[PDB]
């Protein structure tokens, strides 16, 4: 009777929190573009359609986006995929050479400067004995002055080599699905209002995440997943001004960007079986690549985020905006990759406003760099080939990244500024809803039964 | 006969409910445990980690009284100094997630008790069939 006996139970549904590796998998349409032209099909099992997303009752768990793991391995994995997509492509060693340059043929006003320089130089042919004289075009942000005459050299040829990307492999993102291996599960908070920390009362488990498209952008993150109703701000410690502020807003706002100059590529040969792509003639007028957004939608969404931001700082507060304070190139402006070419576009025209306590379109001008260096690795510079024809691209602005100014000395206004910083925050805008947990079977409980001899 | 009855849920589906209702389904929580160019190394070490964990659990269950019963009982009496709970409340009140934080202190001893109990029972029945 009162001699209760222990009983072991295998497969009790219970878990703990843990950390492990994960699993990369995408759809079957990515295999139609054959022969690994897109990346993430070297290492991708095709996803199985309609995975289970099972719902749960009463059980309530707490989440934390800020000490969350698996974002770190995502930031590792994208870098590793980027590096694996380059070693089968050609090096650009014999290109570091003395360049004879001049201005392009254009009726130039004297005070404006040329954005294009026109250079000619020597290059080895297929044989070793012949050498030829050839010409091409470059942007001003790639050549510098070596020091009568006037001659230049490339910017990177004093610290590193340079690798050209292959023109086969594309750059557009594709929906990467993450999945857990056998013996774990991924939880998901389905609550409508959950700022990013604490308990969530309606959970659901899952085996694989939704579609995630990895895009690289510094401010004003693109093609993201908007929230349901309101505009949500999230931060780690708000009164601390060291941490960024992530703003996810509800309705997407359209953005256009375009480069209008018609371009002609040209194939120089370096030697045996080595191709190289210059930028040949320019058919048309030299215009400037730019971006358009609508006026009133932008003003209305900024009114939305002011109305939501006022709750975290008291109602009677003047709030204003300002452009970026300074630093290197790709953090003042915002920067992205459209059509297989990289844009750096000035954003000072959008963040100039002040807000009291109670048809036309905005343009902004951009610049074009040909060589890039993402992640600021110490010996890794990447060239990018030019493309053909007029380029334009349409997208949805979805979120924002902000930073409070550390204002002491008794001022009621609280200015805000955009700041790019890490690349990790763009993934943290999408993995704010998943923690990974580990199954544990074999519970043990007392009850009234006893094993016979 | 049945217009609308509770059919079954996915694995960890019942885990919010009480333990008495959750004990009706274990096979679902048991089956989803085995199965359903540097990356191949990560997949292979994931798979062998999975089978290593499952084999450890099978061996640890094998050294007690029940190899493959999936529900066992044994001959170790419950000491009430661990749990201080009534019988009437636990099967109709609490969840396993709620249970595990309560019984977290008294672990790693009960396992050794089961080991010694199974060992002594095996040697005594060995002596019984020895005189048989």
């Amino acid at each position: 009777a009162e001699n209760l006996w222990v009983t072991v139970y295998y497969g009790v549904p219970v878990w703990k929190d843990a950390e492990t590796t994960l699993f990369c998998a995408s759809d079957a349409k990515a295999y139609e573009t054959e022969k690994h032209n897109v990346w993430a099909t070297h290492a991708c099992v095709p996803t199985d359609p309609n995975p289970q997303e099972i719902h749960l009752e009463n059980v309530t768990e707490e989440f934390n986006m800020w000490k969350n793991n698996m974002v770190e391995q995502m930031h590792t994995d994208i870098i590793s995929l980027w590096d694996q997509s380059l070693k089968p492509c050609v090096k650009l060693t014999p290109l570091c050479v003395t360049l004879q340059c001049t201005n392009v043929t254009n009726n130039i006003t004297d005070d404006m400067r040329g954005e294009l320089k026109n250079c000619s130089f020597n290059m080895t042919t297929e044989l070793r004995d012949k050498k030829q004289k050839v010409y091409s075009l470059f942007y001003r942000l790639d050549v510098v002055q070596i020091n009568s005459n006037k001659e230049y050299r490339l910017i990177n040829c004093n610290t590193s080599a340079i690798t050209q990307a292959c023109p086969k492999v594309s750059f557009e993102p594709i929906p990467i699905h993450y999945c857990a291996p056998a013996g774990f599960a991924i939880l998901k908070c389905k609550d409508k209002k959950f700022n990013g920390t604490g308990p969530c009362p309606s959970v659901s488990t899952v085996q694989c995440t939704h579609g995630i498209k990895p895009v690289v952008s510094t401010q004003l993150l693109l093609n993201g997943s908007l929230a349901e109703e309101e505009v949500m701000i999230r931060s780690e410690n708000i009164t601390n001004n060291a941490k960024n502020i992530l703003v996810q807003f509800n309705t997407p706002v359209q953005i256009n960007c375009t480069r209008p100059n018609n371009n002609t590529r040209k194939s120089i040969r370096i030697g045996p079986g080595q191709a190289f792509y210059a930028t040949g003639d320019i058919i048309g007028d030299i215009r400037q690549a730019h971006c358009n957004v609508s006026k009133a939608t932008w003003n209305e969404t900024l009114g939305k985020v002011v109305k939501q931001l006022r709750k975290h700082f008291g109602n009677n507060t003047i709030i204003r905006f300002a452009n970026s304070s300074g630093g290197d190139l790709e953090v003042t402006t915002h920067s992205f990759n459209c059509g297989g070419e990289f844009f750096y576009c000035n954003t000072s025209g959008l963040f100039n406003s002040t807000w009291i306590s109670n048809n036309d379109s905005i343009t902004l001008p951009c610049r074009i760099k040909q060589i890039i260096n993402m992640w600021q690795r110490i010996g890794q510079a990447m060239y990018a080939p030019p493309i053909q024809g007029v380029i334009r691209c349409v997208s949805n602005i979805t979120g924002l990244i902000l930073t409070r100014d550390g204002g002491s000395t008794n001022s009621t206004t609280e200015t805000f500024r955009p700041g790019g910083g890490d690349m990790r925050d763009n993934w943290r805008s999408e993995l704010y809803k998943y923690k990974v947990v580990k199954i544990e079977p074999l519970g043990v409980a007392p009850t009234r039964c006893k094993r016979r001899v | 006969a049945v217009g609308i009855g509770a059919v079954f849920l996915g694995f960890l589906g019942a885990a919010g409910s009480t333990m008495g209702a959750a004990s009706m389904t274990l096979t679902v929580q048991a089956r989803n445990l085995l199965s359903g160019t540097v990356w191949g190394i990560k997949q292979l070490q994931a798979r062998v980690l999975a089978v290593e964990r499952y084999l450890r659990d099978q061996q640890l269950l094998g050294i007690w009284g029940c190899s493959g019963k999936l529900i066992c009982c044994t001959n170790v009496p419950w000491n009430s100094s661990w749990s201080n709970r009534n019988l009437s409340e636990i099967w109709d009140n609490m969840t396993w997630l709620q249970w595990d934080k309560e019984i977290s202190n008294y672990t790693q001893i009960i396992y050794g008790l089961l080991e010694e109990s199974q060992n002594q029972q095996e040697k005594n029945e060995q002596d019984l069939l020895a005189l048989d």
Partner: antibody
Framework: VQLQESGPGLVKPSETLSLTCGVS?????????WSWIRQSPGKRLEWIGYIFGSNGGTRYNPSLRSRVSISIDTSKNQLSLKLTSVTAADTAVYYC??????????????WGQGVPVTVSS | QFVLTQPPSMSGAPGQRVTISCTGT????????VQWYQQFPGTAPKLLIYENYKRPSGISDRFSGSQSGSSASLTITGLQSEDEADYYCQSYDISLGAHVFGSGTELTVLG
């Protein structure tokens, strides 16, 4: 075992509709499920919730889970439904049902007669 | 939105044999039991088929039921004039965690 419905047919907006389901010929404590079903205009059928007869364990639709509550009183042999802050989508006909015996020659499910409930100002 | 899809209306001569198909996904039909219900207009519904092929007492063996994959089917052999009604398929779904109904099918008997 017969099932019948009771309550006001008209509810003001943002208020709480209440329903009483009266059962004859049997106990409410029996090992059976008791469920509420509503039917919108256009005959859109929608499950609300159910509660087991013996111990009273509940399961609702999650999509309305904030505003719905179901209770049982064995003393009056009655089922009770409460829905707070009703709006125009909740105009519906309401039935309360018992699941039926798991035997060979059952009558099938056991249906109520129904109450029509209008949300209006 | 209904996670269970049916064609909305169908008609047939008396004595005919028809098949009403209920179409859903694996996550609800493929693991659970499905039921077939009958209601007249202005009338509380009645169970016809429970557990995909079985009929309770009080109901004739005139109807038959089958289930395959993510689809269910009821078959009427020898349609009678009484069967002008609305029929529904119903099951339980994991992903919503809820019982769900079909699109509804109004059987209007010809003749």
């Amino acid at each position: 075992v017969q099932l019948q419905e009771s309550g006001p047919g008209l509810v003001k907006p943002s208020e709480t509709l209440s329903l009483t389901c009266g059962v004859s010929g049997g106990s409410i404590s029996d090992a059976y499920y008791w469920s509420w079903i509503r039917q919108s205009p256009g005959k859109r059928l929608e499950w609300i919730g159910y509660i087991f007869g013996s111990n009273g364990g509940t399961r609702y639709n999650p999509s309305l889970r904030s505003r719905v509550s179901i209770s049982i009183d064995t003393s009056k042999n009655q089922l009770s439904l409460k829905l707070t802050s009703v709006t125009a989508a909740d105009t519906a006909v309401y039935y309360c049902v018992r699941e039926g015996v798991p035997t060979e020659a059952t009558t099938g499910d056991h249906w109520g007669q129904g109450v029509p409930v209008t949300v209006s100002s | 939105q209904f996670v269970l899809t049916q064609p909305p209306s169908m008609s047939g001569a008396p004595g005919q044999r028809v098949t009403i198909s209920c179409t859903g996904t694996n996550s609800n039909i493929g693991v659970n039991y499905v039921q077939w219900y009958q209601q007249f207009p202005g009338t509380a519904p009645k169970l016809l088929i429970y557990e995909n092929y079985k009929r309770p007492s009080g109901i004739s063996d005139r109807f038959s039921g089958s289930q395959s994959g993510s689809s269910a089917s009821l078959t009427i052999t020898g349609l009678q004039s009484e069967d002008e009604a609305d029929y529904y398929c119903q099951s339980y779904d994991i992903s919503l965690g809820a019982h769900v109904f079909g699109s509804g099918t109004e059987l209007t008997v010809l003749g």
